[PDB]
Each structure stands twice: as C-alpha cells, then as structure tokens.
Amino acid sequence: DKAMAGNFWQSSHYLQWILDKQDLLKERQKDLKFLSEEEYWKLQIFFTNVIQALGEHLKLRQQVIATATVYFKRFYARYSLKSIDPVLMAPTCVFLASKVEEFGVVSNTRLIAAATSVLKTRFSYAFPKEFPYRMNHILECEFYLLELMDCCLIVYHPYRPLLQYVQDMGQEDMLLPLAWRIVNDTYRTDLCLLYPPFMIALACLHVACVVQQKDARQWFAELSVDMEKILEIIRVILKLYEQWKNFDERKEMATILSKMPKPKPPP
Amino acid sequence: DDKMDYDFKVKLSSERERVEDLFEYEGCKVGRGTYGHVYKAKRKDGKDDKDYALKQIEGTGISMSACREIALLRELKHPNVISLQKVFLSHADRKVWLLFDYAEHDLWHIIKFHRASKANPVQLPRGMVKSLLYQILDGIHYLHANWVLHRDLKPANILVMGEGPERGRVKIADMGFARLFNSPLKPTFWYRAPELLLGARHYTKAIDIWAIGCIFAELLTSEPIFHCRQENPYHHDQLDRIFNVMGFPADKDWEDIKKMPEHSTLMKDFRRNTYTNCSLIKYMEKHKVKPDSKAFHLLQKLLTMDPIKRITSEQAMQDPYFLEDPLPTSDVFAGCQIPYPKREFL
C-alpha cells in the first residue's frame, strides 16, 4: 500500500501526531497517580506485545500491525487507561487498521475468535478470565477511536525508509533482518509519537551496524540529518534493551494490571 | 458500554457536534448511489452562507470502503480534487457523514446541456474545453503521484464549482477508494479501457488516462466517443464500438495484447477486416475536429490502445496544446456567464 507514500511532510501524521514530549508527559500525569513511570512503560510494552500477537494470528503484515499499535498509542497519549479498557481497545485498533487495506478482510467472527484465542493461549499469566467483549463492543469502541484520532488513519512507519537505506548501503543481507527487528522493538516506546519515521529507521540501522561490527561512519556522514536527534533515538533504543533485561512481564503484568485505574460505572 | 468510563462518555457526548444541529439539509437530496446519498446543506449556526455537500455513507458502521475513503480524503489536498472538510460520526444510528464544499455543476450536466442545444452550441467560452481538460489532468496527476487511482472516472464524477471564490474550478470527486485486491474482477462501460474489457486483473494509472481521453473526446463533440447499447469483464458490443471508432489494433500496435486473458475470445469473435476503414481520424473529422489540430494529436495519445503506449498525465500536461492560444484559465468559464442551470433536488 504505497498510497500517500511521498507525502509525509504534508501528512496528518506529521502535522498532527508528532507530539511534544512535554505535552505527552503532562497528560500522562493523570495515570501516574496510580502507576509509577516504570509500570506505565511495562504496560505499554505489554499491549504492544498483545497487539503483535493478534496481528500474527490474523496473518496481517507488519505494517498493518504497526498502524494498529500506533492507533493505540495515540488514544492513550490523550486519555487515561480508565476511559476504555485497553483489552477492548487493542483488538479494535487492529480491526480498524486492517480495514484501511483493500487486500483482504477481517470478519467479525474471525476478529472475536482471534482475540479470545490469543489471550487464552499466549497471555493467561495476565488474564485468568476469558475475553469478555462481543463484536457490538468492538464497533462502539471503533467509533470512539476514530473520533479521537480526528479520522487520521494513514500512518507512516520506518520500514519503507529502512529498506531504502539498507539497499543504498548495499548491505541488505547482513543488516536488514536485524535492523527490521530493532524497528519492531521501537514500538515498545514512545518514539513513533515523537520523531519522523526515517529518523527512527536511521537510528535502528546504526544500532544494527554496531551489533554486527560494521563500519558505516562514512555512509552516515554523507547524509544531511540532525544527528543529535538520531543519537537521542539510539539512547532510547539502548535503554529499552536495559528495561527489557530487567523486566519479567510474565511475573509482573497481572499485578500492574490490577493497579490500572478502573472505569467509573453509570449512576 | 457498561464498562467504559461514565465521565469520559458523557463528556464526549456533551461536546460532540451532531450533523443535524449544524446543517439544514432535509429534503435537499441532490444525489443517490450505492455509495451513499448527497444533500445540499446550509449552515444553521449562521457564521457562513456558502452551500455545502453532505454525504451520508451508505450502510452502518465503518466499512472497508468507508474506512479507506475517510483515510485518503483525510490526507489529500489539491485544488482540483474535492476536499473533505469534516467527518461526523453519529453514534445513535452509526451513520457517517462527510462534509464538502458544494459544487453546483458537473460535466455530465454541462455536456448534456450543449447536446440539448444541438436539437435547437459546443462549449461556448473558447478555452473551456482545454481548461477543463487541463484541470482534470492536474488533479489526476496529484492522485497518481500519491499512488492513488481513481478507477471510476467519468463526466458525472468531474464536478465544476459555480459562483463563489472557486468559480469555474474543476473538482474530481467520487474516487473508487476500495476495490478488493485492487481488482476490477471483484464485486456504463463507455469509459473503460480495452485492457479492462479483455480481463485486466488490476487497475492502473493508464486505465484512468483512457477515461480522461474519452471525456476529452466527449467535450469536443458532446457525444460519448464510445457510446454503446446497455446490454465477467469481456463485453463484446463495447469492444465492437471501440473498434468502429478506432480501428482494430495491429500486432505492432499492442504486442502484449496476446497476454490478455480474453485475447482468444477476441480472436473468436472479431475479424480485423470488419474495421479496415475505421480510424480516430475519420471519427473526429465527422464531428468537425481537425486531424492536424494540437487537440486531436493529444487526444490520440490519450486514447492509445496499448496501455503501456498511453501517455502519462504529466506528459499530457506538458503537451504543446496547452501553450497554443487560448491558454487554460483557472475558471473554465473565463468570466463569462454560466448558462447552465443549478442542481435539481432529487
């Protein structure tokens, strides 16, 4: 789906959903009354993994999964985890993302079946009880997701730029698998809300070069990019791998999920 | 939702703009379609006085078609492509409304008007035709450069702004935003490229350009160049119409035709000899268009039978036809009075 591919600089993604980091943390302070900053990041990681699991079950391509992940991050960048249960939002985001494509269709029964199966088989350490929402809840949630995102549905990602760079390097076999994999892991962070995709891509390719002891200093020099912003992104990638080392989601997530603020019922 | 936060829910509902509070439109339906119904609408909260178009999307919820149309309209911005102003999600009926600036005219009604005057004129301002064509190509080019195809281009889909700040400006509308697998094989033919009728499996830029060629022949003559009786991608009589106008392609004209799925059926049904004295030249001469005009030579590049030999939209905008007097005007009516009636309310 090359639709709009060259248009990032006039896109709703760039003009509306590259957020200021300070606005983000300010709107985050409301859910930090129940959760520490670690616990909020661990949650973020968890639901990235939940959304990925759903995408794989439904045989969606990575870009569609990324868009779903991004819908989810946008919604909770503005609103509290209590406003809509993120167990309901994650499959809603996947479903919506997938209807932005014309190659294929995700049916209602198939969506619900995928959600039920993935939580039971792959996330029973966090969820004792079965997926409780029916398709009518999904359709309701869709409307609130669409409203909140201001109907901005086209989302750019670093995979396309990354391919262009590795092809340009003449190093696709050595570096693409790793770099691609690091790009996936960036969605465990806020980076896609804070930098344009090609900058995340460059950061990922740099880290891949360091892990494979490949000298790329001249290639990067020959670019015209704010390298300090790139270094910013590398540091977030390196730190994420330190939080990943020290994190046992399987042991911790049920407890962090119990601390999440809860929806107020009606009078 | 029982377990969606109440405060959040009532707060969003208190602030949510509803289409029926902001616009007066009931009874003012101006178009119907499988895609959805269109109303002329005026703004209640009177801080405006322009007309607007309200499209109510057919069906409920967000279908794949709706989702893609919102997603792409939301991003595209070009003077010659209809511009989404606002989306309304109505939560009670789960209906979706899209808000556009209203366009009084279109080429289906403009052409029909001039054809009516043949009973008792052929596009009066000198460069109206040229100007229309140039703007159609401009907007199609924007879409093609964003890897967006139209896929359903025809005179009714080429709107023209009336009195107002955008007077006389073309607005391409009603793109076919969802086609499963980008396929014409999945659930009139006058504007369909021959490769479609022979079973092309995918829409292409070039199929849009053929349609532009057909529209341009229709603006020069007021007749659909490939008019056909209203009788699976293969449509025999429509192919018969194309060949009576154009002639039958020689092997050299369209080498890859033999790769079309319906090529063998074409050979079964048709014989080159049937069309031996047929050509675009002869067709357009009978409609008082000169074969050595720059208009004719551009038209012939646009109606090329082999899709790979068809000119692109960018090459057509560079054509010297647009440098020859009269130049294209940003208002296709070139300051003249608009003799075309306004929209009837269906």
Ligand SMILES: Clc1ccc(CNc2ncnc3ccccc23)cc1
């Ligand atoms: Cl032949 C024809 C018949 C009816 C219509 C009505 N459709 C419309 N009229 C005015 N502005 C519009 C803006 C966006 C989408 C549709 C619009 C168009 C062409």
